Every structure is written in structure tokens, then in C-alpha cells.
């Protein structure tokens, strides 16, 4: 079955309607799918504090969404975080590499997530979350997940700085015109998988531009990944940085473009 896990505490949160998103996502996989989910933390407004503010005043979300993930990670279950930022995985990706040091991390976003405090130009702790679950700097909550067992996905126009400090930790990349199912198998081999999704990997706006090169993912590669990951393999999947308000159109339209693209994935599960 399928534990679902929704983060409504700011972490670090820059755009206005993330946390909204997550509540939207969540309820539509309630009552898609006949569940309840687990809320954890307070929402809080969004601001431009940097990094080492905007971390310690997370700690509190953080600290739950860990207790839980791991919970539900320990158990028999598919591990389905609805997380309104990037950055609630620094909570998440450090009990996925304790508890599977075989997992594979699809990291599926449209940027690499891997500055460290030194290389950010913004301060942005979502830009530096998987850089912090591979220890190149300290989060406070852990870290543990191999360079080596991460994959990201669908990235593109990468600052070359942060490219090559992807490039020598060993990540891989696959930008989203080789992020086929094969493509993404092929990086995963025999290995348990954690699928990390934040949907700025999408191709924007046009749902058919027939005539022209997607420069993102579109929903169609997404879904495919997701059919492709054997269910025996998947050990979890979080939906990270939908920004839509609360009761918009928007907000309706974009979730079920999202249950499109997880149903293979949910649906095995569920049964
Ligand atoms: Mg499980
Ligand atoms: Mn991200
Ligand atoms: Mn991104």
C-alpha cells in the first residue's frame, strides 16, 4: 500500500504557492486513491532569507518529516512524499541512504540542487540539497547518499561551476533529450530506486508543440520513467515544488496533469 507523507512547514520556501501545491497534490492522491495523508508542520510566508537562516528555522518541519519518512521507509509500504520544497529532502535522502545503501536516487529536476555554501550565488537552500545529502556541507540532518548513487534527470543549463563540482563528485546527468526509460534503467541497473521530482524539470506552457524541440521533460518522459521502475524496486517517490495557490484553476489542472504521470507507479502499489 502507499504511506503519504505532506510537509506544510517552511523550508527555506522563495515562491509564494509551494506549500499550497503540496496541500492541492495531496488531496487529490487522497481521494484518488483512498487515503489520508500524514501532515507535518506549519506553513510559515515565503522570503529571500539565506541558507543559514532559513535552515535552523526549519529544523522543527525537518525533524518530523524525518521521523516519519523513516517510519514508513522501516515498513512495508511505498514511501509517497507530497513536500512543498526541494529542501525537505535534506531530511529525506539521508534515511533513504542509511536504510538502502544500494538505492539508486533519480533526482529528476530542472537544475543540479548541488551548490555548497561556498559555490550558491543566491543563498537559496533548495539549490544546495543534494550537495547536502552527499556531504559536501553540513546540513545538520545527515547526509550518507554515495555521489556515486545519485542520478539527476532532466537538468539542463547547468552553471559550469556547479557542473563540474557535479562532474567530480560523480553524479550523472541525464538532460531531458536523453532521459528516455531505457536511459534512466540503464543508470539504475539492479538497484532499489527513490524517484525525487521537482517539477521545474517540465517543459512549460504548449501541451502539444508538435513542431518544436522540448528544451524540458515532458510529461510523457516523466510517466514513462515511472512505468518503467519495477515496483518490487521502487522504494519511495516525492513531489516537490508545485506552485499553484490554493483553489485556483491552475492548482486543479496541474495535479491532474501529476496523477497522470504517477499512476503506474501508485496504481502497482496500491494493489
Ligand atoms: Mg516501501
Ligand atoms: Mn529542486
Ligand atoms: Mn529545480
Known amino acids: 500500500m502507499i504511506d503519504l507523507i505532506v510537509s506544510q512547514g517552511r523550508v527555506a520556501d522563495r515562491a509564494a504557492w509551494m506549500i499550497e501545491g503540496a496541500a492541492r497534490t495531496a488531496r487529490a492522491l487522497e481521494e484518488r486513491y483512498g487515503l489520508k495523508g500524514h501532515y507535518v508542520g506549519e506553513p510559515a510566508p515565503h ?16 525533524v518530523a518529516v524525518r521521523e516519519a519518512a523513516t517510519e ?6 511505498l514511501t509517497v512524499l507530497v513536500n512543498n520544497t526541494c529542501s525537505v529532502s535534506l531530511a529525506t535522502l539521508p ?9 539508486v536516487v533519480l533526482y529528476i529536476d530542472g537544475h543540479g540542487d548541488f551548490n555548497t555554501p561556498e559555490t550558491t550565488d ?9 550537495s547536502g545529502a552527499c556531504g559536501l556541507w553540513d546540513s545538520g540532518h545527515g547526509a ?20 563540474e563540482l557535479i562532474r567530480k563528485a560523480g ?18 541497473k539492479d538497484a532499489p530506486v527513490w524517484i525525487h521530482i521537482d517539477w521545474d524539470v517540465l517543459e ?37 515544488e508545485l506552485n499553484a495557490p490554493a483553489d485556483s484553476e491552475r492548482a ?20
Open 122 to 130: 543566491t543563498g537559496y537552500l533548495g539549490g544546495m540539497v543534494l
Open 72 to 77: 514508513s521507509i522501516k515498513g512495508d509500504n
Open 144 to 163: 550518507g547518499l554515495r555521489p556515486e548513487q545519485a542520478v539527476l534527470v532532466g537538468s539542463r543549463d547547468i552553471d559550469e561551476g556547479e557542473r
Open 204 to 240: 512549460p506552457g504548449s501541451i502539444p508543440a508538435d513542431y518544436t524541440v522540448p528544451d524540458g521533460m515532458l510529461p510523457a518522459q516523466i510517466r514513462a520513467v515511472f512505468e518503467a521502475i519495477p515496483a518490487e524496486r521502487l522504494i519511495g517517490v516525492e513531489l516537490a
Open 47 to 62: 522570503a529571500d532569507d539565506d541558507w543559514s537562516v532559513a535552515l535552523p528555522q526549519a529544523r522543527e518541519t525537518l
Open 95 to 103: 534515511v533513504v541512504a542509511r536504510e538502502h545503501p544500494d538505492a
Open 171 to 188: 553524479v550523472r546527468v541525464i538532460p531531458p533529450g536523453e532521459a528516455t526509460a531505457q536511459a534512466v534503467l540503464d543508470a539504475v
Open 252 to 271: 486543479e489542472q496541474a495535479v491532474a496533469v501529476i496523477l497522470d504521470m504517477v499512476a503506474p507507479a501508485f496504481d502497482a502499489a496500491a494493489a
